[PDB]
């Protein structure tokens, strides 16, 4: 919440004074060509002006979507990396190099183009991309075109990544049965992994959706409370509005939102992070340590 | 546009007459349905025992009251008719009168149907209850009388709407 | 809702009045009730199923022979109607709901219907078929009562099997294969070999919980009496008989229970 | 222009609805009488007349249709839509009332056929119920006559 | 011209309200007769739920009365907005009353049976029915607010 | 223009559908409560919570209808077709969401009340289910409020 | 002129259909949980997974509806019929996907709640089936996002 | 001018119908899988084959929707009706094929769950039946792609 | 003018009807083979013939639809409404014939699975019935091909 | 003119309806024949006569469709609205007659399978019903051909 | 000039509805014949009367359709408005009469075939009932023949 620069459905004083200042506009409207000119970026959190502005929804939605994509990429990378550590700890066979390496490389490379494009747009400020033209660049499977491409090597980089992804598909299916035959079940991993990677990548957007929903509900509650406090500033009306706001915060903000967030977080952790580890089975060893008596 | 113009150009006298007739028709249908519903239970009770014929007849009378009210409303609507002059066949007053007549007729018919169905169900239950025990007949009759007020309310609403007729 | 007034209202009122009036003497009362039921002749299918209920037992009794001529003495029209030994069984396979299924299920005739125990097994199979047929005619609140009755019969058969009929090949598999929540969760009674085990199995259904109680009475009897006696005790629920619903089966059951009580009275 | 067509359609509906209602009531009463005949045949004719009483509704519908037919003539006056629509409405109202009364009377007679056999003392009650039902048909006929009266503009 | 819709609103408001009122009263009445067969005293007091259902008709009747009074053509020019508003106001009141009565009929029918079984739960049934009946009052509030928008 | 003929229709439809959903929920809730309290009158008071939870949808629909009604004022500004269309869309969305939430809450509450006397844990399980269901109604109300607010610009 | 009507209707339809699907799923899951938890307290919390799994679809639908509502801005760009058609298509796709996912999730959750009293080894399989079904909601959200992104590029 | 109002609708309908068919299949597949796992937890993991294959229809529908969305490029070329109508028809065909395949796969999986529970020796036959059913979905996707490819007037 | 609408609609209808018929036939065949997969797995392998026949019928329908689509080349020759109407009629006929043949073959296979399970001697009769059913699909495909060829005769 | 918009559609519908009727009849006959063969494999080969006889509907429909397709030729002579309307009417009559004949033959064969399985004496005699159905189909085809012969009567 | 479309549609409808009635009758007739089989195989030949009646109904429908089609002579006597509406009405009447007669004949024939086993001497009475029912088919054919030219050739 401190990072989000939102406190109890209300902004506050950031570590800086004001990130964005209305370009001129001593009397002009906010919606203008000059719009708002930013002196410097607020380091503690998001710009305070952005939260209450009309343009709050698009910028916040784009930022949340990018953050969700990056977090999902990081979690998938960590889960895939844990496979090599698990194989070494259990001293697993050559199947790690046979299957874990292509499995951790194919999805990583496939999401790498999108992650790098997001970073470059954030880094280079390639406004000719925004949230949409990034997907547009990712949309085209064919070669050529690339007019909107921002990466200097994107024309060849996209083709190289596509070739690597295409070649990685058999490399994740053949070597384990080959080693099994040489040393003399892959159907479970077959087909399932390809669709599951896309499913896990998509599921990361659940966090962004939940964050947006929580922000919207908090904004609605704060707006209701402010409307009660401003026009109905009468003592009885103000007290009733405060009680209603407290009840709403207890119900939706406190209970429902937290429960939904916890359930979604657990679902994400099991679906993707646990998908590349754990592997199930086993049992909990327990001695007769007076457990019933304890 | 052209279809909309044709729809707006329909004769209001036809709609008013249709509503006037439909009010009486729906009232008669609802009264008949309620009468049949009450009569089935009354005949069953009489087969069980002919002692409660006088008590049972109240339900039939209440059901027929709906038909009587519908007939009165139909007579009022017929009185509300006019000569329908050719010059004012599409005048705003004529259209308003026709729309009001149609609305009043539809309201009266629907209210009469609902009241008749409710009265028939109540009487069908009440006859069986009286056959079970004659002591409960008073409460059942009171409930039926209270439920019969739907037709009276609908008739009142229709009569109030009937004052809107202003056909030249 | 309006269909009741559209048709069947007079018959429903007559049945309600007859039931409200209800409360060799036992034989005379049974004959009077049977005459009242017959004189009453959609609801036709319900009446046919209700009659077939006892007609299954009547046909099972008539299937003997072996002093078969004595079946005419108990020719009560309520259950022993003439319209409802494989050669004669094929002829009797008509005009009954459970008969066509029993023709294949009991194709062994007396071999699968031995008078010691297998005749009871054939009767239970016929009762299960009749209960399934009655439950097929869904659309009213009587489905719950029919399910309760079938569950009581199945549970009583299972209890009898576990008590002493286990030695008569009525094993856990036979608790549902031959012994007629029960249509979905009857597997819990396959291991209830003890009265305490029976109570534990009954604990799976909180409504069925505490119904067994000490199990000194009701469950003490074999065949279909163990959980059927629970239904007899709980028949006060059937005494509700909310209006504008099929209550012909309820009235028939109440008349049968009254006849049974009168018979149990006998010489005080 | 189309007013004669509207009036003819209304008369046709007035005839057809009443005929259908009377037919349904008579069929129900006949089924009831056939059922009751096997029990107490001495009473088969004791309720046959209220069973065929649907002829009253049939005759009322025929009378309404004849009245509607009589009122339509180009020679008397070039009646406009205000007359044809009124005639159609009167005919439809009369036909609907007749059909409803016929259905109600058929149900009541189906009940009474068994009721009288079960209790001969209930014949007077059944007759009273039938008269109460036919009161609706009488009211419908009166309303139809009143409506058709004003149609001669 | 447009006033046809406005007139239709008042008729629809009463018709749809009475349609649900009769359905609620029928279900409530049937249960009362069933309880009155055995429990003589309980049935007399249980008639309140039927009386509660019958009140919904009165609420619809008043709403219809207001709509009729506001359709005076010779008084003020009933523009299309007034006709549209009156029809919309009636539609909400009629639909809400139909639903509100339907719940009362379903609840009331079970309540009669429940009271006949255990008299203690009579208070609980009344509380649930009273809470359900508030929806008709809620519909009445919306009808008044919508009808009040006939200023221009 | 003709925009009010759609805006007021949507506003009325919101309340109508919300009331229908609330009634559908309340009927099932009351049936289940009566069934439970027939045998265990003690838990009748605890079983009444889903009834109020369903009834809250009626209040939400009434608030949405009041907002929609206050959002139309020809004397203030010319309500173009866009404003009326957006108001009608908001009303329809809020009403449909309320009706669906009411039906779901009624089914869940009836089931829980039927299972209430079987185990006291139902007192928590049914409450949690009702809260999860009412979350959908709250989300629908928020969406309707957002749409109604966005309806105010109309260029 | 009439395009904003289509866009607002599409957003409202998306929200309403998503709410209806989530409500159906939640009602099915609640009925299943009420049936299962009477016997054992395990279903009270260990099997409350579908209760939130179904509301996730409603949250996604609400997010899509909010995005669509924010998409329309007449003061910033005079939307042609292209924008309205695209918004309506995106809303319809999102709502239909939400309804389908809600129905499937409700059926699967009811089956899992019924099977909860059986061998607990099937919990992993039930969770996997629920996740595979819920993948449809994510697919629909992705399709709606793509349509909304392509919506504003009208000439 | 009105071509996008058909093309976008066709794409949305394709996605919606594919999702509906996938859900219809997955409901029966999951019911059967839960029943088998309750009966025999050993093969529960290996019985998710129809459940997993159900999502292939949704993936194909999403791909077709993406292709249709990429088809509508007003800046690249003025979208005449000849392209929008073709895109809408391709989307409708793909969606209907997906729905039919989903229903067939649901029925096949519902049968095969019980078939494998009784005897796992029929797993090969169940897989072959599922593949034959999914061949229809593959053919529908191919036909939709071919139809969408003809947007050049 | 608007002929491409008719042609595309006809092709889509052909594909949809063929897919629906094939799906119904395959579902019936699988329902039938479910019993044979346990009663006699040895004969179950030979029981996959009706599924193959249904797939063949679907393939024929798809081929006809593909031919119809390939017949539409606006840049080569202007498509008059006559050609579009003819193509739409051909597609509708092919789709209806395929759907009917698929349903008939599915019912036949569902019966024949049990028929062969009871007695292996009925395999010849089942094969003959399947061939007779597939003859109808062949005739429908031939008629569709003839109509597609005739569709280009306009001027 | 817009002649093929109705003529070609009717030509397609003739074959479509004939195929549907033949499929229904063949499915019923095949189910009956499978049941009979399960009862007795000896009669399976001899009982295929109704199945074969039901196939004449497909041949008649294909012939009618080919004739109708050949009857449309704008290059040879322009066809007015009447020229297409007559062909469409002939096709519709032929298709409806074929469907009715197929349904009747299917019912008759379904009965006759059991009739022959029970009493072999009546097996050959029962073919009279099938002969009558085939005669009805032939009469319908003749009527359709007579109607279609008026293609060149226009002027 | 659009009347010939209606006329051809009416002739086609006549043929189609006559065929539908014949099929509906023949289905019940064959069901009854099969039911009477084995129980009394001797009376198999005597049970073919409903089949003959259905064939007669189909032949009458075909004859009416051919008679209507014989009026399709656009080379002379310009159709005008009558030649379409009259032909369509006649075809519809003939087809509906054929369908009703076929349904009645099927019902009566099935009932008789089922009842042929009990009191086999009642075959004459069953045939009499069947003929009294099938007389409606002849009445409909006569009505169609009357309407075939009454309002068709008198357009002048």
Swiss-Prot record, chain E:
Recorded superkingdom: Eukaryota
Membrane topology category: Multi-pass membrane protein
Tissue specificity field: Expressed in leaf, root, flower and silique. Expression is lower in roots.
Residues in compartment: Cytoplasmic: 25-46, 109-120
Signal peptide residue numbers: none
Lumenal side: 68-86, 147-152
Record-annotated membrane-spanning stretches: 4-24, 47-67, 87-108, 121-146
Keyword Repressor: no
One of the Pfam families matching this protein, by short name: ATP-synt_C
Single Gene Ontology MF annotation: proton-transporting ATPase activity, rotational mechanism
Any single Gene Ontology cellular-component annotation: vacuolar membrane
Keywords assigned by UniProt, alphabetized: Hydrogen ion transport, Ion transport, Membrane, Transmembrane, Transmembrane helix, Transport, Vacuole
Record keyword Ion transport present: yes
Coiled coil: none
Subcellular location: Vacuole membrane
Record site feature (Essential for proton translocation), residues: 133
Function of the molecule: Proton-conducting pore forming subunit of the membrane integral V0 complex of vacuolar ATPase. V-ATPase is responsible for acidifying a variety of intracellular compartments in eukaryotic cells.
Subunit relationships: V-ATPase is a heteromultimeric enzyme composed of a peripheral catalytic V1 complex (components A to H) attached to an integral membrane V0 proton pore complex (components: a, c, c'', d and e). The proteolipid components c and c'' are present as a hexameric ring that forms the proton-conducting pore.
Family named by the database record: Belongs to the V-ATPase proteolipid subunit family.
Protein name: V-type proton ATPase subunit c1
Lineage: Eukaryota, Viridiplantae, Streptophyta, Embryophyta, Tracheophyta
